[model samples]
Target chain A: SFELPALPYAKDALAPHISAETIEYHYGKHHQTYVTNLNNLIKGTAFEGKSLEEIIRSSEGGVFNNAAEVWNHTFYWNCLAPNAGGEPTGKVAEAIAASFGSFADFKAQFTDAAIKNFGSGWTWLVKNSDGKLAIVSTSNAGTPLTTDATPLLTVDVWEHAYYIDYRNARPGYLEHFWALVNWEFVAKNLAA
Target chain B: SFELPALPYAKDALAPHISAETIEYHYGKHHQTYVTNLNNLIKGTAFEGKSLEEIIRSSEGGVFNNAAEVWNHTFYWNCLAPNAGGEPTGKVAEAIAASFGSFADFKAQFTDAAIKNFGSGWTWLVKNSDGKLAIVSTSNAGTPLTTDATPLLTVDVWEHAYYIDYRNARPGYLEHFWALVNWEFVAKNLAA
Candidate 1:
């Protein structure tokens, strides 16, 4: 059952910076293709019994990308709100103040961390082994589970994510993305 | 006829951070090939009488890439400064303040612009249609010469440039890049 997730808001709701048309292709075509391909690849196989996370954790090579894409998109949509600045709020906000000195400093560090992960990767703000909030970047299809932390928010710096909207303006896209954060969800997670 | 220009400094000079071996392959073998192929494609043809820049101005379709690579690499090597980066001390520094608010601000914008370009492209701080400097990013082989800018400085975000030194750590590469700037050349050619 390849159930396409419903977007939290109308496709164009994150407008001006993120066009509805861009979402149409991103969620509709781009993400949907990954789902369909993974479904097909898994059909009539022992992989069928595995949970999506299990599939993601165990698979190697091309399957890793497809499986990770499936997981990543779901998490990505959950972490965004129509007007999410993705700015730190709640306990996470206080944590930001404590660990990184200030929210503004965290933002600078996060943006700089994301900007520099070469090739295809994700920039993450993770819960590092020190139990402190940290900014980290990962290579293609990788997640923080591979390391020692939990991810608060993620920006897919890949070309496919922003190439259409920003077309090599990935950072500009990222700058605009802070406003679309699901801070309430992050707050709840941090509190939990 | 297009020929690979010799690097301005000894390949060994940038040793330790950038290996001489890498430079031999990067500057000597890889970049040299682009020029060699370009010359072979244009010789004894309609482009024979044309200056390298002239052929670049007129060619189209498939012939454009080889023609343009010759020109691009010619300019690419000149953009770096040895032991590079500090506040630009003169008109360039003054211009940076006027155009982007401050040197710190200019660094932020230019670095963001460079790292965000999704794949093989050149990021340029070019004079735009209105004669003010604007940061520009291009897809492969696309140049400001064909568009609305007179280029002042450029950074090649092509994977090959930083793949070895930084691996997938692009932000680190950008951070490290402050070391190899060729600001004297940039300032000398500002009005050119």
Candidate 2:
């Protein structure tokens, strides 16, 4: 059975930007439920003993939704840190500049995509097959794992992601998200 | 330009079940935003002079999303009331029994459908072309208006619909929803 990975920081670590109450529901409840559902769904099925990535890449319907959500929530938690935000440096910085003009341009475009993602979904920064960075928005449990692009970073645009903290003002949540982004994790994803 | 319709009941009327805080965001914010977006999208376009139903039937992409959402929210608000719920009586009751065995069975199935509705969407009780009652679930701005099924009743299963009040417990929200179901309105829809 797939287990929920431990949160990288305390529930209150991302407070103000994301509240403890939000974490209790988003992580404690929503994320846990997905993992539990995934396990139940895969039991007596071909996906029972498979890795999440394997299940995600091969399955569809309920199994896909649960597995992708489990993976997505874990990735989203690592993408954030209490004091980690602003801009990236080193090779990742150069990559961003080469692909999207500058860090500011990337931020603007990413923010726009996240805000207008339309429904329960995620917005991602991915390294394309050509080794260039691009923004992608996937609806519902959609993830880049199902595509050719390598997901470097993602922000959960699902209403549950920010409804507790930002209510219906998704743009406001995006504004605060930049302050908590863990660029080091993003840089690591790119390097890999 | 399309406008938000006035709510049928006071914002605080459905309190405890669906808090006024939820109404502020769900109706005052999300619903209003859809209306605002629909107006802006149709400006200087072929859809500008058309009614909401006309636009919903003919458009796709952003225009369809906003127009259908506007109609759906309006219809959803009427599906609920402070002192309503229990079981239906009269012809609507007869129809329910004919379609799904009994009200209890229909409730069980409808609740199951809403809980498993995958992603952001609405779950509906509709009257099919054959004049039979049925349940339909549609994702992200989807409505029965787009199909041959005439919507009789609906519940907003979008996370934003109950996130504020129930946190991640959608099942809890569904429990309370039965307490607020406006059966009279549902019966009227069947008769019409």
Candidate 3:
């Protein structure tokens, strides 16, 4: 019953920052597989008719794996856009400064987290239990929704997320990501 | 005090099955990064003089991650050879037959394990605590060495291990892996 969400921007919009070829596989194949697998797996099961986040909260193993990916990848795609990224504005900017000292400092810490995440995961800027902004990285099918945190932004570090465009140069991929961050979306998530 | 091992065959030797490009990135970059990161992270620490496997057993986080990958990639390299793969011979064959019923059955189980592994990880043919062969999959820098089992063969399911050569078709990569398996190395591991 679930569907792969549409990319807010055109597949090629992310361009050289994130290649069209990478998007083709990441969204068209990888994201689609999760959606398809989740649909199939939850069919005729207790998970059927449950919201994606609902299954993520209650299920473990295969069901959790697919459901979380469905959620995370959708969040990830919305976190980028063409000609995006520079600095946060409005409440996101204020929170970044408050939580991490300055936007630059927050950027460094977030970048380091993404680099050192060590495996397939997403590095996120989240509002933690105290409503304080914080940077956290989760490994493989992990999401802040599973914890007390509210995710505002995320950058995927899964190899499939960047291998074709950047190979083993994750730092290279991420440098581009910093320039492509959809701060407007982060602000929206923060507002919510 | 650590070194990346030489790949057992020419980088391009596994061509069309596994590309020279994939080998260059996987062995040259990914494997080398683990060795380098392991050496650096362990430097000036008690782990410095310890064996890679020793560090893997004792350390956690970055040290364990790099050390385990160092050992795992070295083993993985040996498990492959150009124009290899077929029925096993010698004691390994006997072990496979005794533990898994027959060569064909073992192949099915291992292939299924490889295919079903959901994310960045490895699927292994290991000698378990009881000295019987069994298939296991470990997620994200995990290994059988952490347990009572002894790893006999591993097929890396990490997207980086196959993405360049096979893109999103992990099954295609596994099919090639089945053809590239060096049963000689497996037999040797069993003997040891």
Candidate 4:
């Protein structure tokens, strides 16, 4: 079974924008349940002993939500950092410039994407099977990996991800999340 | 049991844009069952104690999807005319401008919201309790009713909502939808 990972920082680390109470419910209850359910699903099944990646690929039907959410949540935690913000540099930026024209352009598209996603899902910066970068959103537990993309990073779009803290203001949440993201993690993901 | 509601027009009536084949399954299989199960759940229980609106108002924990979906699907059918679309004028256009600046701006927001919606849900133009206008999208069965808004118009994002006809390009579906929207109804709702 995969280990349950603790958040990189204290419960109240990201405040004002994202209350500790919200994180407790999101990172604690919601995400914890996914991990538990995923394990319960695969523990005695053919999916046991497989890597999360393999289980995800093999048992990729109804199990995709719990599977991808487990992956998305774990990565989401690492995708942000303490006081992180501004534009990104390095190869990711270069890729961003090529795909979307510029980081500013990419940022606009990213922001618009995060804001416009209608319901519960995730927005991702993923590399397609052809090694092309793209912006994509997956509902509930969906993933571009289902379409064979290499995921770089993601923004969780679940209402619980922002509702209590931001209320009906998702755009605000997306703007503020820039600070908590771990670009190093994303940068490393790019190099991989 | 929530009985499947019949299509207002026969299958294939919407034709070219919305195929009868799509309606056959979308309503025959999906929407119908949702209604049937919803009615069944409300029967002979505490849920049976309340009116439909009351049950929907109390749609907090688990009943939100079934209850709201029933309400949403019912309202969805009534929002469209066979073919109609023009610049909003009269009090409705004035309200759109007040809420979102202009009819074009509102369309942009509504279109973007629907196109980027992360999953199967809906986008709506609703009037708040104070008669202020607002635009929002609901996931699965999530509705403005939960937030206590007067429902006006909605765009269904369920793949079945448009898929057999529009394929993966939902923007096209939304575009055609504008032409079919029963604006007179929206105008009436706003004045209410």
Clashes (candidate 4): 15
Best by TM-score: 2
| B52-114 per-residue lDDT for model 4 (tens digits) | 567888756445567777778777776765665677679988889988988899999989988
DockQ of each: 0.04, 0.85, 0.82, 0.09
Name the TM-score of chain A in model 4. Answer: 0.92
Q: Roughly what TM-score does model 2 have, to 2 decimal places? A: 0.98
**DockQ, candidate 1, vs. native dimer:** 0.04
Give me the candidate number with maximum lDDT.
2
Q: Write the per-residue lDDT of candidate 2 for residues A1-192, one digit (tens) a residue.
A: 888999999999998999998899899999999999999998998787789999999999999999999999999999999988889999889999999999999999999999889889999999988887899999999999999999999999999989888888889999999999998999899989
Provide the TM-score for each candidate, comma-separated: 0.51, 0.98, 0.97, 0.53
TM-score comparison, 1 vs 2, better candidate: 2
Order of candidate numbers by TM-score, starting with the best = 2, 3, 4, 1
Candidate 1 chain B has its poorest 10 consecutive residues by lDDT at: B160-169
Q: Which of candidates 2 and 4 reaches a greater TM-score?
A: 2
**lDDT (Cα, tens digit) per residue for candidate 4, span A1-192:** 876688988888778657888788778877887798888877778887888777777766546667778888888888876677567788888988888899888778888887766556889988887787888887778776677788888888776687566644578899888777677888898888
Backbone collision count in every prediction? Answer: 13, 0, 0, 15
Candidate 1 CAPRI grade = incorrect
Candidate 4 — which residues are off by over 4 angstroms?
A60-62, B1-192
Model 1 reproduced share of reference interface contacts? 0.03
Q: Assess candidate 3 and give its TM-score to the true structure.
A: 0.97
Clashing pairs in 2: none
